[PDB]
Design an enzyme around this catalytic site. Structure first.
Site, mmCIF file in Angstrom:
data_model
loop_
_atom_site.group_PDB
_atom_site.id
_atom_site.type_symbol
_atom_site.label_atom_id
_atom_site.label_comp_id
_atom_site.label_asym_id
_atom_site.label_seq_id
_atom_site.Cartn_x
_atom_site.Cartn_y
_atom_site.Cartn_z
ATOM 1 N N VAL A 1 -3.842 -4.744 -3.311
ATOM 2 C CA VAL A 1 -4.536 -4.167 -2.204
ATOM 3 C C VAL A 1 -5.884 -3.549 -2.634
ATOM 4 C CG1 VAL A 1 -3.608 -1.818 -2.318
ATOM 5 C CG2 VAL A 1 -4.255 -2.753 -0.104
ATOM 6 N N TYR B 1 -2.470 4.360 -2.506
ATOM 7 C CA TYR B 1 -3.135 3.080 -2.339
ATOM 8 C C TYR B 1 -3.313 2.686 -0.870
ATOM 9 C CZ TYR B 1 -3.030 1.733 -7.228
ATOM 10 O OH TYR B 1 -3.229 1.707 -8.597
ATOM 11 N N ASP C 1 -13.564 -9.142 -11.353
ATOM 12 C CA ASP C 1 -13.914 -7.722 -11.473
ATOM 13 C C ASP C 1 -15.346 -7.708 -11.987
ATOM 14 O OD1 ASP C 1 -14.450 -5.123 -12.343
ATOM 15 O OD2 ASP C 1 -12.341 -4.745 -12.704
ATOM 16 N N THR D 1 -2.084 -11.984 -23.104
ATOM 17 C CA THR D 1 -1.136 -10.877 -23.143
ATOM 18 C C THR D 1 0.209 -11.193 -22.484
ATOM 19 O OG1 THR D 1 -2.126 -9.841 -21.157
ATOM 20 C CG2 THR D 1 -2.976 -9.231 -23.286
ATOM 21 N N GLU E 1 3.501 -9.238 -13.742
ATOM 22 C CA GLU E 1 2.608 -10.295 -14.197
ATOM 23 C C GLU E 1 3.190 -11.058 -15.361
ATOM 24 O OE1 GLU E 1 -1.423 -9.416 -16.301
ATOM 25 O OE2 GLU E 1 -1.845 -9.920 -14.209
ATOM 26 N N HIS F 1 -6.445 -15.270 -14.371
ATOM 27 C CA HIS F 1 -6.830 -13.924 -14.579
ATOM 28 C C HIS F 1 -8.258 -13.902 -15.166
ATOM 29 C CE1 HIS F 1 -6.909 -9.920 -16.315
ATOM 30 N NE2 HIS F 1 -5.719 -9.661 -15.785
ATOM 31 N N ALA G 1 0.844 -1.162 0.000
ATOM 32 C CA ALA G 1 0.000 0.000 0.000
ATOM 33 C C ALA G 1 0.883 1.216 0.000
ATOM 34 C CB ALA G 1 -0.976 -0.002 1.164
ATOM 35 N N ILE G 2 1.225 1.627 -1.202
ATOM 36 C CA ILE G 2 2.208 2.655 -1.377
ATOM 37 C C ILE G 2 1.505 3.884 -1.985
ATOM 38 C CG2 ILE G 2 4.270 3.122 -2.796
ATOM 39 C CD1 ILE G 2 5.074 0.132 -2.118
#
Ligand code: U5P
Ligand code: U5P
Ligand code: MN
Ligand code: MN
Lengths: 284, 284
Positions: free
Chosen positions: B151, B65, B265, B184, B242, B172, B61-62
């Site tokens: 996160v 975020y 999602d 991808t 990824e 994914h 968590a930078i």
């Protein structure tokens, strides 16, 4: 440490297409159930060869059952772990009667003399003791996995590294479609092998089990120690070593289960559609 | 050494009934693909509790975020490994901004300060370095498994010990129904992450992977070392960490694959019939 796989061209797995629509291919504890169509043997062969895996195969040929060795070993040479290092361990009371079977490269055979018990039930049961004693004597130092089978059988099709895992059992061909109440587990509470009518995942066959040396020594020692408790109490489990094996694998779930392709009797059961291959079968 | 399971009453597995008829539940290398209906969580919980398993969960968590942490952690408390020992590791450039989330018993949180990179791509990529450095610092001594996630997500349903294995990746959500040519992957041969058009099993998401501490340290170190080679050669993989993760898992097959239930999602993809549960989802 596991080296990287080389580039390989093979069909993409399709996530929205089941590999079998007629059978269970994974247990409720997420162990694969090995049927034809569930694995790509090219990938698995690469994985196991990169580890230079050695597989031990134990077989008991005591008294008249020495007659079964020639076909057993000849057919193992055609079908069992071909391409991999194999060490056969033949336990017998008649070392001189072991046939001279020609072996492929990287394959060896050791003859281990043991005592013959009078009753077939004790011959069958005391395999557990003998396997667990040889785990120190030799197996820990010589092989990565052990496969423990009955001798009155023949290989008819591929039996390879798809079976290998820390602990496996095999679905007994007489019960794979049965409800658990019909399973011939030991049902007397006086026996260490007792399993209640409302318990049980599968009925595993005593004629084909295995795993890593460590897990097989644990299984065989536990089954031997349970047999000795029963003997002290004057009880012999209904299906002998197989009953104790089933108790063990109920309480210690296998990490793979082999389908009845791996333990079959065509004389008694024919060739059902659900079996795409008959790999290891009873001699009628 | 694994102690014996207690007696448990649960439905018998039926060998001639597939657990899913709409999806692949085992890879061609005999790794389970984890979907609802494939596992009995009561059995798996018993197995893992008898080992007193501790699960570590890393999250970065930078910069902005940090705003995602409160929901992330609150929902992890409702859904992630409940009943088991959990150690959260929050890596952040703003220790003071970590919210005070109340934890259940046997659960703890450590805040690890790290540097912030300017580009989001480098923030995302340098997780590999940071995870691999902390494997010595702490993880080997404190947890049995590590789970490494994004996160900007929330748990909506159970995520438990069914995921645990030596090495796992997650399908994914954008590609689980796609053919490999559409994946991808990095396609430039100049990059260490290059995968040819005729290779590939699955497209794994960088937002959710894990395994045993040893296997995660191997993965993260390999991906970091590949990133550094690319950087020296002036190339950045198309999907950053990824892309390297996908290269690694092509060459080093995971021992379980998680379905897109575990990385979803709903805004972009809705709720297809094939998903019986949406467990860990994007914050829109
Ligand atoms: O007199 C006997 C009895 C049993 N066995 C071994 O034990 C296995 C299990 O016994 P059975 O039920 O096949 O007779 C046999 O396949 C064979 O490997 C012998 O070698 N000799
Ligand atoms: O500025 C940033 C960029 C990325 N990340 C971490 O890296 C993950 C991957 O990046 P993203 O594609 O979700 O932005 C984020 O979920 C978050 O955990 C940060 O914390 N801060
Ligand atoms: Mn027999
Ligand atoms: Mn994101």
């Amino acid at each position: 440490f596991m080296v990287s796989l080389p580039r390989m061209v093979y069909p993409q797995p399709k996530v929205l297409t089941p590999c079998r629509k007629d059978v269970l291919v994974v247990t409720p504890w997420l162990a694969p159930i090995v049927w034809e169509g569930t694995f790509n043997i090219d990938i698995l062969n690469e994985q196991f060869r990169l580890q230079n895996t050695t597989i031990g195969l134990t077989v008991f040929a005591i008294k008249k059952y020495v007659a079964f060795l020639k076909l057993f070993l000849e057919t193992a040479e055609k079908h069992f772990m071909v391409g991999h290092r194999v060490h056969y361990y033949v336990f017998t009371d008649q070392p001189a009667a072991v046939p001279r079977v020609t072996l492929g490269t990287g394959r060896q055979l050791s003859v281990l003399e043991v005592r013959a018990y009078k009753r077939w039930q004790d011959v069958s049961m005391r395999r557990m003791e003998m396997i667990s004693d040889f785990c120190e004597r030799r197996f820990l130092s010589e092989v990565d996995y052990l496969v423990c089978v009955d001798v009155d059988m023949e290989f008819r099709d591929h039996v390879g590294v798809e079976i290998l895992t820390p602990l496996f059992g095999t679905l007994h061909p007489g019960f794979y479609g049965s409800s658990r109440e019909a399973f011939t587990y030991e049902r007397r509470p006086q026996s260490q092998a007792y399993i209640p009518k409302d318990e049980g995942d599968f009925y595993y066959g005593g004629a084909f089990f295995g795993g890593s040396v460590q897990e097989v020594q644990r299984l065989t020692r536990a089954c031997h120690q349970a047999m000795m408790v029963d003997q002290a109490n004057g009880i012999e489990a209904v299906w002998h070593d197989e009953s104790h094996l089933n108790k063990y694998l109920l309480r210690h779930k296998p990490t793979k289960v082999l389908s009845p392709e791996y333990l079959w009797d065509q004389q008694l059961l024919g060739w059902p559609a659900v079996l795409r291959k008959l790999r290891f079968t009873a001699v009628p």
